[PDB]
Design a protein around this nucleic acid. Structure first.
Lengths: 240, 88, 166, 129, 123
RNA sequence: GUAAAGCGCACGCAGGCGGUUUGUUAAGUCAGAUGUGAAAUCCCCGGGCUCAACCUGGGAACUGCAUCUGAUACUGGCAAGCUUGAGUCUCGUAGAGGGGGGUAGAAUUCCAGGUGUAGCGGUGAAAUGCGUAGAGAUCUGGAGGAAUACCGGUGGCGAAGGCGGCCCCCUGGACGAAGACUGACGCUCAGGUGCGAAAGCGUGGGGAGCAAACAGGAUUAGAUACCCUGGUAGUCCACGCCGUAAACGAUGUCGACUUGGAGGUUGUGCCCUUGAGGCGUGGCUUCCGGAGCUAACGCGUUAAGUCGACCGCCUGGGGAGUAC
RNA sequence: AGGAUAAGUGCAUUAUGUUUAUGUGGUGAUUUGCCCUUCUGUAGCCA
């Protein structure tokens, strides 16, 4: 178990994120300013994560349909990368609302989506005006890239994995409205209140987004050894 | 302003004669020396109302300490009040 | 597309109706806005404002919004166990304990809102803004200051609330 | 200067929970000690001690059953200058016999239920809500 | 603020249901009519509406509504008035009872018939 | 806060009120005891008249009142503390607080002489204005009074409004720190006395520029608004007479308590003193946002939160901050 | 010779971003304003 906080004494930083005053309610779990700007360190996140690392164990016991949502300029690859497993679905293009609350319409549009995708990729999408077809193709690709998470997955996910807060406000906004428990990675410009499970950290890169949420940890890997007597008998391969 | 040699003379003449500046008689006699000092300024001119707020601070507080004192002992009060003069 | 809460009983309390205007930019369209209250028989925080082209499509929209992001809440007997003064956004309403010997005493759409709320015998005077849109919060704020019975002795009454989690 | 110290006592218990503290410490009247014992036995505080005399001080530990308890709403009703006394006929029933009124009688500080059962009156101190 | 402020410096006191101007501490009262006016309307209207000046017995004078086609009125006749503001006139705070004293009962009403002096449910 | 409504502000007697403990007293307090509180129309239980309305026995709200005995949990009285409130000495520090002194340079303006010729000015654009009696500008030297940048900032000071070149004398009031002392000396404040940004305004000082008025231009249905130009009292200084207002932490007074972070700028411990910084611990003063609050803006540790005592004030508008 | 932090080459109209005349009062869109639930119940109003 201890391996997950053996890695937080090893990464955790961003050296600040935004503003001189930052978000006051995360101040306890985090380091204060130095030389006319704001700096953060990995050191102030380990006393918090000495018990709070037990929540990665509760999203791995019921694991089957997980959704990694909220992409950013350096966080996008990390949303793909922690969700690289085959029980775990992900987007690569920015999320927008109604993808969980008007899920009705979205599932009608998925059902359209995989049909026009087999058509476009076989070559069967031709029109005597090539412009009207190639332009529909570019926009179909953006749908595929945006929806790829819920697209191949059996329905509304059993948790919602928000990596970013800073620009991907909506992914957290809709998770509270569907009542689905939240699995959150918060930065020093975001509060740890109003979400059910946290990693204290930063929102970018592989510093907190798969360093506890992968095979290198022990706490996402002892939750999953508790799935093997509840709904399955063997399922530990699927997941990271 | 108030200086070391006025303050020492006051401790010597009023309250205990060493190591006390805080007691009711001597506290009143230290305030007296600043009221006198303010009346020193008020012997150049009389449109000094922004300082007068302060004069009335030092008096109002003498009224507070004279009240306390006469409720503790009528001797310290009647001596002090006559030995520090003021009014006709 | 959301979870919803239900009651085994029908409420279709239409409280208000309005129309949307832009007046030059596309001129003025026929659209209406509507406010509709969905209780439970013992209460809900259920209040829904929605809008559409026509009055029927508009109310049914608003009736849907009165049962999503909302949960039911519950109170034993046709009275409230606290004399408290519920305020929500300048519409301020009052309650005091009472008998069963009195039922409702109220008018307009308010007598219909209080019946599902369980606070109709305790119904005392409203003050501040008492037009339809905000007067109807009885079953929301007046059930968030709530007290409800669970004791066998009045001198165990504060002890019994402490051990409910200790 | 604060002229009512039992309103101040209660404002410290109130802010105690609002800032989610586990103990709340304060200056301690004879009255205070005497009130804290009723609140302890009717289970609005969990426990307390009183210690020093050269600085006399009350430490109490809060109510919880929800994480943020009904201790955020306890208010003085018979205060300095707004003294109001109730007889054995006029005693305060608070919150349909869920809530307590704390009443200082001539026979000591107790809740309204025990003051009624004795048939005393007295100074009606504070109601819960 | 506190009850102490209110013992030490007492407040004012509102009443309601008594804010329509009225005289001799009573609902109806007699006076001699002094003058008849056709006068110009208040509110955006075009009805040149009809009012009387009345001289009441307690030494004051007030202006009161009249109406109905062909009603009898002269500038010396005794009529009874009842409080009731008229919101289309230059300051009519009373109306006149056609069925009272020197004037007799008239038609040309629907909406108040014990007022202005009328028989039957609508005939 | 802005809807009607925090006194203009400080200081504070009478009255209202009193952190904490011991001693003590028992004015108020509360319990107990006893006496009183007739009658029904009302209220509760009967009863009678063709029910009822009505009237009425027993009980009662009887709407009002008494003193003795006892208690001390509570407030009040009083004596000695306590510090957990406040007050005071030396030490240090910031600032346009107050009163009185000292002092320099440069634009507008003027005179003089030298050099020198036609526009200069004003503005949205403009004309009125000034000028060939030589203007405008420029070199040299004198005249004179308000005024004093940029540093100067969301700073800081004063009682609130209030304070602005720089310096000192006389002196206030605040800000920090250690040694030291007193030990509720406390809180609020009807009445109260005291006290002005500005102009108004008496006399004294003074006048370069600007200006109500008054003229004239420009504008236009005009043109008193809009905009300019001459031009006076005024502005500009000091005290003095009733102190007006947007006279404000817009938020009474003062205080206790409630996650912080950072800005401005400052005592002081610590730093590579590494840039108005960070950390340690106080400071006023401001951004940002959490618990809680608003109708909204907004507030949020300086509250508009949780409250405290005690005082001020409001009860639709207009007409009226006038009348009386 | 300190008018020598040399612009800290950190700097940009540098803090009112302004002015050349106006033209009355009300007026559009419905008579079922009705198509989600047992019991505790509802829109003229019901299981």
């Amino acid at each position: 178990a201890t391996v997950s906080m053996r890695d937080m004494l090893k990464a955790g930083v961003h050296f600040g994120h935004q503003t001189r005053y930052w978000n006051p309610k995360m101040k306890p779990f985090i380091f204060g300013a130095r030389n006319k700007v704001h700096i953060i360190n990995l050191e102030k996140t380990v006393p918090m994560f000495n018990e709070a690392l037990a929540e990665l164990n509760k999203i791995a016991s019921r694991k089957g349909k997980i959704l990694f949502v909220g992409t950013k300029r350096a966080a996008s690859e990390a949303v793909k990368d922690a969700a690289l497993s085959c029980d775990q679905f992900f987007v690569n293009h920015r999320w927008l609302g109604g993808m969980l609350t008007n899920w009705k319409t979205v599932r009608q549009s998925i059902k359209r989506l995989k049909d026009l995708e087999t058509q476009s990729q076989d070559g069967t999408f031709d029109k005597l005006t090539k412009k009207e077809a190639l332009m529909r193709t570019r926009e179909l690709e953006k749908l595929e890239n945006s929806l790829g998470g819920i697209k191949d997955m059996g329905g509304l996910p059993d948790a919602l994995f928000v990596i970013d807060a800073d620009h991907e406000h909506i992914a957290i906004k809709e998770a509270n409205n569907l009542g689905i428990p939240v699995f959150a990675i918060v930065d020093t410009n975001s509060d740890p209140d109003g979400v059910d499970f946290v990693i204290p950290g930063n929102d970018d890169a592989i510093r907190a987004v798969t360093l506890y949420l992968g095979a290198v940890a022990a706490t996402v890997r002892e939750g999953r050894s508790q799935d093997l007597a509840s709904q399955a008998e063997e399922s530990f391969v699927e997941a990271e | 302003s108030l200086s070391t040699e006025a303050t020492a003379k006051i401790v010597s003449e009023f309250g205990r004669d060493a190591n006390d500046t805080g007691s009711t008689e001597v506290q009143v006699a230290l305030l007296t020396a600043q009221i006198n000092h303010l009346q020193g300024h008020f012997a150049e001119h009389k449109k000094d109302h922004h300082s007068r707020r302060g004069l009335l601070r030092m008096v109002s507080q003498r009224r507070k300490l004279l009240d306390y004192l006469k409720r503790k002992d009528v001797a310290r009060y009647t001596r002090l009040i006559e030995r520090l003069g003021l009014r006709r | 597309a959301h979870i919803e809460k239900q009651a085994g009983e029908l409420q279709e309390k239409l409280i208000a109706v309005n129309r949307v205007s832009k007046t030059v930019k596309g001129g003025r369209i026929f659209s209406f806005t509507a406010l509709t209250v969905v209780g439970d028989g013992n209460g809900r925080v259920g209040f829904g404002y929605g809008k559409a082209r026509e009055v029927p499509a508009a109310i049914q929209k608003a009736m849907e919004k009165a049962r999503r992001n909302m949960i039911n809440v519950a109170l034993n007997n046709g009275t409230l166990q606290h004399p408290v003064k519920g305020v929500h956004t300048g519409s301020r309403v009052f309650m005091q304990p009472a008998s069963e010997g009195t039922g409702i005493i109220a008018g307009g759409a308010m007598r219909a809102v209080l019946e599902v709320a369980g606070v109709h015998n305790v119904l005392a005077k409203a003050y501040g803004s008492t037009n339809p849109i905000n007067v109807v919060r009885a079953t929301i704020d007046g059930l968030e200051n709530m007290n409800s019975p669970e004791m066998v002795a009045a001198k165990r009454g504060k002890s019994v609330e402490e051990i409910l989690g200790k | 200067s604060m002229q009512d110290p039992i309103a101040d006592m209660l404002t410290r218990i109130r802010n105690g929970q609002a800032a989610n503290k586990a103990a709340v410490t304060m200056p301690s009247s004879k009255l205070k000690v005497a009130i804290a014992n009723v609140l302890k036995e009717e289970g609005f505080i969990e426990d307390f001690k009183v210690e020093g005399d050269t600085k006399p001080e009350l430490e109490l530990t809060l109510k919880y059953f929800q994480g943020k308890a009904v201790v955020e709403s306890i208010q003085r009703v018979s205060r300095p200058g707004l003294r109001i006394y109730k007889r054995k006929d006029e005693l305060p029933k608070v919150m349909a016999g869920l809530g307590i009124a704390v009443v200082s009688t001539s026979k000591g500080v107790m809740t309204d239920r025990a003051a009624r059962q004795a048939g005393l009156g007295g100074e009606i101190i504070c109601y819960v809500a | 603020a506190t009850v102490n402020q209110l013992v030490r410096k007492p407040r004012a006191r509102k009443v309601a249901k008594s804010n329509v101007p009225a005289l001799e501490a009573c609902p109806q009262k007699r006076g001699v009519c002094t003058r008849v006016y056709t006068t110009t309307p208040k509110k955006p209207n075009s009805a040149l509406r009809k009012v009387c000046r009345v001289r009441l017995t307690n030494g004051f004078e007030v202006t009161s509504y009249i109406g109905g086609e062909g009603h009898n009125l002269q500038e010396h006749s005794v009529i009874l008035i009842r409080g009731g503001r008229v919101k289309d006139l230059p300051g009519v705070r009373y109306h006149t009872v056609r069925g009272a004293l020197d004037c007799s009962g008239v038609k040309d009403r629907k909406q108040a018939r014990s007022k202005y002096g009328v028989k039957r449910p609508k005939a």
